[model samples]
Target: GLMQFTLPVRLCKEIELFHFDIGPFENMWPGIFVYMVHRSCGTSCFELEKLCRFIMSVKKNYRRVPYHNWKHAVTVAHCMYAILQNNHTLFTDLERKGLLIACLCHDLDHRGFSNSYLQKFDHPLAALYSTSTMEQHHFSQTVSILQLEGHNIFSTLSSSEYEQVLEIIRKAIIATDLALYFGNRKQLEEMYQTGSLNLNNQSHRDRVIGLMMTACDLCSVTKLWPVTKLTANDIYAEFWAEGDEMKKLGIQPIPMMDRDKKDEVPQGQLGFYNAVAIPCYTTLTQILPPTEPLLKACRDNLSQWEKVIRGEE
Candidate 1:
């Protein structure tokens, strides 16, 4: 049986504003969730009703972690939605649909722990995938949610189309792992320099999608000051919590995870910006000029972090 819910007219308008402005997405996510799927994927009302139920279920499954919760998932999806709209013809219809869904489901069921922690504890997930552990688990969870009755939103697609969409989702989700970012970044940078980063080519397009996933996943670094600061604090809170847990287990947590270094959070963020976040958005803007805002925002945040490091904040 398909589930159904009505989107309030006012909330509908608010979600529409999400494209140009940041609103209280925590409450309006469900409406935006359904709207993005329907608009991008061309699902009928009946299919959307079913997808609405599935999206709600997926939301319920997310843990109450400070950073990687339902809000983060919705935020990433919204960012991806904004990216798609910025260049509507950047990808095929199928790729657009696949990217949106991948963003929505990429961080499903996060437990506020890192892959290294899971491997250290011999957690089952670490053993299951062995590499890209959390990302693989997230993809598996996505498949599980879609497998449920009334949740197969892609059912209307041809078998081959469905498989291709899933493959795109898999690659996009797994690409969220920072470990994979450097390789993809190098490839994309080379393409941009040579002016060969054409989305018409499947291979080039796939690389772009992978890089886009990273951009959206780390989008907080490109947000306004208040939002970026809040996101940084929330993420560090989650990391500190994991460190506390690791302490109890008599494990020496990594420097980033060590709660004792809480005061150095801003400094750590500066390092992250210099090393990973800045280069990422910079590369993206080179390929897609409309994405320049992302790079600009990250640079602004980088300056803010610099002030903190200099005791000017």
Candidate 2:
């Protein structure tokens, strides 16, 4: 009886990794990333030690903000993972890896402020990029991290693939900006409407990939109502802090950003769901029906937000 033991598959990998420990990154993230890097039946795509180092660097680079922190990054990447569970073959291995890394590092070096904040205040990053202010900075920061010794998780790829993945990452991180979303969505909307949304076609694929990155970034739309509300509260906290600073500097913020407009939270969400979340999620489902669950979740949250505004609980 003492010899009757069978090792669990999951634990085997964990212990194998634990044979060499750095920090307490033994949480869910490393496992997800390792699975992504080692999806093929061969050696890992990148060095585990390098991955861990890059991950830690990403963690530290994500400044201690209210909403755009390491947790949000992980949440977005997890949604991408969830999406891949049923649709693994939808994208190439390089595309999937690039997308996941882009998702995680999309908001790198966020300073708890909007892009306009930097632009309006004449920040250095604003001067560096005349458009997509923080996004360009984030991509720059990603490149800088990769330039660090042993932080290039993408080194396993050939020079061509490295360049391609870097370009993909840059495009993806830039697309996360809400301001640029409609431009990305419009072409896809036309294609889908005209029944030309081919996944195999390069242009169609590019548009879909861009929008999918946005969908994952907006994963709050795919979460439970209470969780969505909690996330919105956190986002509002950050927005209100920025609003407060704006007022201190003699600028006015929109009602949505006003701390005093607390009662309008539900109202704001209702508008957001109808005008942005529902439409975006619905389009995602149209592109890939497997994403219907996300639309359902978004719709339910909209209903809940409507209920709140109507005093119907």
Candidate 3:
């Protein structure tokens, strides 16, 4: 028998998505996202069913890679879903929809290779876009899925609203690239310092959306210790796989990707926490105080990584 796309009626009644386990659940994600879209977008029953089908199709397109699979997409989406649960009033309807969709599709069709890896090999995707190569691909793939017949769940949206949502998703997904995070973090911090982070300002709102994308993309950093360790290992497994391929192609892998330096995993995570993840969440909390627990969770995980590093030495 085929797996069910929608949740069982009793199961739906029993579990809240916000309280769902951080670990992977092949059967649960489609239902969680479908429920989230309906909850946030106020879709009708027919629209909700259409969205469930669309989400299932989107899940089908994700490659079975270690870190960038459907599971990871759902995890990111879940984090954004949780964020919106408390802070929905802060976002416009269109922005809320965009944030949810972007989180769900941010890594669509990821091939487990970083943009730098693609450029180094002159991979065709690298040739396709001059900047934000992978992010562009993810966004483009999302559009293709939406364009498919019977899967255009956004068809209920007015033409203007559809365009607005797409633009938001595009910007949010591109912002997930770590290359953009430092500048985004700095911009948000400076705005906060100057008391210029007025959400009514389009520029300020866009920056917050971008930073929120970063926070959701790195959500695992703020997960509990067991989940954090599991997620980090899954990601590094993908990185090590890439390193293996690079070696076969006679290319040198970056330190993080190099399996031989596997002992450095804890340190590398600490560096990411201090430099990227912590700062991103810290600034996000400054804008959305409801998000402060995310920062606290990240700090706790950082302490765990610190212990791992100490024990290693």
Number of the predicted model whose TM-score against the real structure is largest: 3
**Clash pairs, model 1 backbone:** none
Q: Residues 165-222, candidate 3: write the lDDT tens digits.
A: 8999999999999898899889889989998778889878888989888888888777
Of 1 and 2, the candidate ahead on lDDT is 1
lDDT for residue 283 in candidate 3, whole number 0-100: 88
Question: How far off is residue 217 in model 3, in Å?
Answer: 0.6
- Give the per-residue Cα lDDT of candidate 3 at 25: 58
- Model 2, position 134, has a per-residue lDDT of 89
Give per-model CA RMSD: 3.1, 6.0, 3.5
The local distance difference test score of each candidate is: 0.82, 0.76, 0.82
TM-score of 1: 0.91
Clashes of 2: 0
lDDT for model 3 comes to: 0.82
Which pairs clash (backbone N, Cα, C closer than 3 Å) in model 2?
none
Q: For residues 1-313, could you state the per-residue lDDT of candidate 1 as single tens digits?
A: 2433346666545443322334555666777676666655555533666677788889988998888988888889877876777777767777877788788899999998888888878899987899999999999999999999999878888999999989999999999999999999999998888887777788887888888899999988877688888788898888888888889889888878998988878878988999899999999888877888888888988999988889898
Candidate 3 error regions (>4 Å)? 1-23
Report the candidate with higher TM-score, 2 versus 3: 3
